[PDB]
Write an enzyme that holds these catalytic residues in place. Structure first.
Site, PDB file in Angstrom:
ATOM      1  N   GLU A 140      10.339   7.117  18.444  1.00 60.28           N
ATOM      2  CA  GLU A 140      11.334   7.460  17.417  1.00 60.28           C
ATOM      3  C   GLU A 140      11.035   8.758  16.653  1.00 60.28           C
ATOM      4  O   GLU A 140       9.881   9.194  16.557  1.00 60.28           O
ATOM      5  CB  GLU A 140      11.495   6.311  16.422  1.00 60.28           C
ATOM      6  CG  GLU A 140      10.693   5.061  16.734  1.00 60.28           C
ATOM      7  CD  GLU A 140      11.189   3.856  15.945  1.00 60.28           C
ATOM      8  OE1 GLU A 140      11.236   3.916  14.686  1.00 60.28           O
ATOM      9  OE2 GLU A 140      11.536   2.843  16.600  1.00 60.28           O
ATOM     10  N   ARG A 170       6.123  -0.271  23.783  1.00 60.37           N
ATOM     11  CA  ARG A 170       6.665  -1.596  24.095  1.00 60.37           C
ATOM     12  C   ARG A 170       8.172  -1.497  24.359  1.00 60.37           C
ATOM     13  O   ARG A 170       8.904  -0.935  23.547  1.00 60.37           O
ATOM     14  CB  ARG A 170       6.419  -2.546  22.917  1.00 60.37           C
ATOM     15  CG  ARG A 170       6.853  -1.959  21.581  1.00 60.37           C
ATOM     16  CD  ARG A 170       7.495  -2.998  20.670  1.00 60.37           C
ATOM     17  NE  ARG A 170       7.975  -2.394  19.427  1.00 60.37           N
ATOM     18  CZ  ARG A 170       8.829  -1.376  19.371  1.00 60.37           C
ATOM     19  NH1 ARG A 170       9.302  -0.838  20.487  1.00 60.37           N
ATOM     20  NH2 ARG A 170       9.214  -0.895  18.199  1.00 60.37           N
ATOM     21  N   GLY A 212       0.779  -1.220   0.000  1.00 60.15           N
ATOM     22  CA  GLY A 212       0.000   0.000   0.000  1.00 60.15           C
ATOM     23  C   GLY A 212       0.818   1.280   0.000  1.00 60.15           C
ATOM     24  O   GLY A 212       0.416   2.276   0.612  1.00 60.15           O
ATOM     25  N   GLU A 241       6.478   7.497  14.806  1.00 59.35           N
ATOM     26  CA  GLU A 241       5.458   6.656  15.413  1.00 59.35           C
ATOM     27  C   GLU A 241       5.783   6.385  16.875  1.00 59.35           C
ATOM     28  O   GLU A 241       6.912   6.584  17.311  1.00 59.35           O
ATOM     29  CB  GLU A 241       5.380   5.342  14.643  1.00 59.35           C
ATOM     30  CG  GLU A 241       6.733   4.813  14.235  1.00 59.35           C
ATOM     31  CD  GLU A 241       7.155   3.582  15.002  1.00 59.35           C
ATOM     32  OE1 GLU A 241       8.239   3.054  14.702  1.00 59.35           O
ATOM     33  OE2 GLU A 241       6.415   3.135  15.895  1.00 59.35           O
TER      34      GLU A 241
END
EC number: 6.4.1.2
Length: 549
Positions: A352, A370, A248, A366
């Site tokens: 980041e 975690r 995509g 993004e």
């Protein structure tokens, strides 16, 4: 013994019921850890822990929680540990399934058959009798249904990690960006740029974007978006939120090929909302380490550089960061916290960023809710035992009531006062002392080959690289087990850590360590890349490395 007291019996009420765990300190026969918690302010006590993961990851939660504890009430078993043991791992004598205090033999095959599994993880959780679970990273580490279903039991299994609601508040590449547009985080030019309306669910703190906003940042047509691109500035990336790993998307360096490319990605994934972003060039991919407790108390633990990627792979990541201006770097930090509060993030998460020194500016890539395999670095330059951190926040203990926390900022470790973390009032630096890394640390993604032909390898899947000519360096090789695509990798994939006074020096001792390990029987290009100035000052952007081979 007896500690200073903190009474946060107030704040617990407003705390999601999924944070409070069954075995609260208000219903337990008096006991050491029941006193170390209470006094300091937490609500739930965790005694048994399930490790929804294996390898070094699983050995890192141990050594870490057994360190803090032994240092604390002195008992490397204070906080028990139930591990999951997958067939292949038992035939490899994982030195971790060995370190636990007990374990339950779990299902083999593709990891979707155990670790990343979710009902199995909790079933076991319900079986073992654990208080909390931990996934560290990888496997189900990201799935927000994991914790959401862990406390969603008659056993109230807390979750040593970010709350599922923290995750669901992320979302596709669109809403994600827009929502982050809210916490006013400079983002990369796209169709949604300037769209930062987001509604927080007062009760649940759940953040979502309402259609009209997500449609304010999409391309209703190929001509509709084509028009965005011009307004933008080629080249641009044609992506579509539900982008499947590598599906995509098309880069369009020049008009003409747009109509052609647009439909391209739209065809791969149908009914998939498309947006057009601005396709950047040789910038940087630093990375911010941010902490936060169960009381909207976010903070950062420095940053990380990793704009030196192998076809987008982290090979060399040194920390702390010296790349961007100090205040320019400072800005991104409060920038990161400016968003953790937003999603009501908890525990630890590394955000980041795209950095361009040409302009000095930087953008939001993004949010990675975690823990990462490369935290050891931020742990040595700050001294914050993260698996000793998040573990206390899970039990509902504030950040200031965190041994290493105060230490970092300059506070009598045993003290129970608060901390003006934001450094907002003159009466803020009489007690405190702004953080600051201690020495540098440069990891290093190493890869060797020790196949699975027939002979029986050395017992274990965690060989610590005990170097002999380097005092400041730790490493290791990990027999790839239960990856996701590899129930076991032919070779292994361990990390290496080097430290020193400054950056330059850290390198020295790093390479120096890459030397001793080259006399055994891989790192060739390593010494190489480190011995080159294009890294000997921290200048090389996103081209250098790949530009090479």
């Amino acid at each position: 013994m007896e500690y200073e007291i903190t009474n946060y019996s107030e704040r617990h009420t407003e705390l999601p019921g999924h944070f409070i765990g069954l075995n609260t300190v208000d219903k337990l026969e008096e006991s050491p850890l029941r006193d170390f918690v209470k006094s300091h302010g937490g609500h739930t006590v965790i005694s048994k822990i399930l490790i929804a993961n294996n390898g070094i990851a699983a050995v890192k939660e141990i050594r870490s929680v057994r360190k803090w504890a032994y240092e604390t009430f002195g008992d490397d078993r204070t906080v028990q540990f139930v591990a999951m043991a997958t067939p292949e791992d038992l035939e490899a004598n994982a030195e971790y399934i060995r370190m636990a205090d007990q374990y339950i033999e779990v299902p083999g095959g593709t990891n979707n058959n155990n670790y990343a599994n979710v009902d199995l993880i909790v079933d076991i959780a319900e079986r073992a009798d654990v208080d909390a679970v931990w996934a560290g990273w990888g496997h189900a580490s990201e799935n927000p249904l994991l914790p959401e279903k862990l406390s969603q039991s008659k056993r109230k299994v807390i979750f040593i990690g970010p709350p599922g609601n923290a995750m669901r508040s992320l979302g596709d590449k669109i809403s994600s960006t827009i929502v982050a547009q809210s916490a006013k985080v400079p983002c990369i030019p796209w169709s949604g740029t300037g769209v930062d309306t987001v509604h927080v669910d007062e009760k649940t703190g759940l953040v979502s974007v309402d259609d009209d906003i997500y449609q304010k940042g999409c391309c209703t047509s190929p001509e509709d978006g084509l028009q965005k691109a011009k307004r933008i500035g080629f080249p641009v990336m044609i992506k579509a939120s539900e982008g499947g790993g590598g599906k995509g998307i098309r880069q369009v360096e020049r008009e003409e090929d747009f109509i052609a490319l647009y439909h391209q990605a739209a065809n791969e994934i149908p009914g998939s909302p498309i947006f057009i972003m601005k396709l950047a060039g040789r910038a940087r991919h630093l990375e911010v380490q941010l902490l936060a407790d169960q009381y909207g108390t976010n903070i950062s633990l420095f940053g990380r550089d990793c704009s030196v990627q192998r076809r987008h792979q982290k090979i060399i990541e040194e920390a702390p960061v010296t790349i961007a201006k100090a205040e320019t770097f400072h800005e991104m930090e409060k920038a990161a916290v400016r968003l953790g509060k937003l999603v009501g993030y908890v525990s630890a998460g590394t955000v980041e960023y795209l950095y361009s020194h040409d302009d000095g500016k930087f953008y939001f890539l993004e949010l990675n809710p975690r823990l990462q395999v490369e935290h050891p670095t931020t742990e040595m330059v700050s001294g914050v035992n993260l698996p000793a951190a998040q573990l206390q926040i899970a039990m509902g203990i504030p950040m200031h009531r965190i041994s290493d926390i105060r230490t970092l900022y300059g506070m009598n470790p045993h003290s129970a006062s608060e901390i003006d973390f934001e450094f907002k009032t003159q009466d803020a630096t009489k007690k405190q002392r702004r953080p600051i890394p201690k020495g540098h640390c440069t990891a290093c993604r190493i890869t060797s080959e020790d196949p699975n032909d027939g002979f029986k390898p050395s017992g274990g899947t965690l060989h610590e690289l005990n170097f002999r000519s380097s005092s400041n360096v730790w490493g290791y090789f990990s027999v790839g087990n239960n990856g996701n695509i590899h129930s076991f990798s032919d070779s292994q994939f361990g990390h290496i850590f080097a430290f020193g006074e400054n950056r330059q020096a850290s390198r020295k001792h790093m390479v120096v360590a890459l030397k001793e390990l080259s006399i055994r029987g891989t790192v060739e290009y390593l010494i190489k890349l480190l011995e080159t100035e294009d890294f000997e000052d921290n200048t090389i952007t996103t081209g250098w490395l790949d530009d090479l081979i």
